Design a protein around this ligand. Structure first.
Ligand SMILES: CC(C)[C@H](N)C(=O)O
Ligand SMILES: CC(C)[C@H](N)C(=O)O
Ligand code: NA
Ligand code: NA
Ligand code: NA
Ligand code: NA
Ligand code: NA
Ligand code: NA
Ligand code: NA
Ligand code: NA
Ligand code: NA
Ligand code: NA
Lengths: 86, 86
């Protein structure tokens, strides 16, 4: 199964809240590449520790640009990019 | 230039209103193929006179399925599919 790429939880100390993202925001693209579902967001974020990514986001009928500075979480094999959203 | 695929006008006697579409609806896909912008909607509708097409549409945060029965308008070279929306 797959889910729409809509934010339902935010880490108050994480990158997504710092970037101005909000519950209910729907991610449309990351660095110009459409995101088809939430798992695509997870996979792309995890692969990009420490990287700035450019989002297009839909919020209440308006398409917005958002710059998101991914953090780093985990150790060894598990070290991954982190956005602070679910 | 391009525009998001959002309905801003509807023919009260046309297929889109009959299908249950509403101002502000955002078309996401036609027959499972993403629509990137409004011109893609125009081109796909015009090419499909008389055809039923399956839409995914975003309305106020909810993804909806909509079956749209395209009509026919125009004569000769200009004969085209018609959805009744702008
Ligand atoms: C998006 C995913 C990788 C994770 N839930 C995070 O906050 O980064
Ligand atoms: C979508 C386009 C082809 C036209 N405005 C129509 O109503 O069909
Ligand atoms: Na969606
Ligand atoms: Na950020
Ligand atoms: Na990954
Ligand atoms: Na929206
Ligand atoms: Na941006
Ligand atoms: Na859009
Ligand atoms: Na119809
Ligand atoms: Na066409
Ligand atoms: Na919406
Ligand atoms: Na449908």
């Amino acid at each position: 199964g797959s889910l729409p790429p809509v934010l339902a939880e935010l880490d108050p100390k994480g990158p997504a809240q710092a970037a101005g993202l909000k519950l209910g925001d729907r991610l449309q693209s990351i660095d110009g590449i459409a995101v088809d579902d939430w798992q695509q967001v997870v996979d792309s974020v995890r692969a990009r520790p420490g990287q700035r990514v450019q989002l297009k986001v839909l919020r209440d009928g308006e398409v917005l640009d958002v710059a998101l500075e991914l953090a780093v979480r985990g150790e060894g094999k598990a070290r991954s990019g982190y956005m602070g959203a679910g």
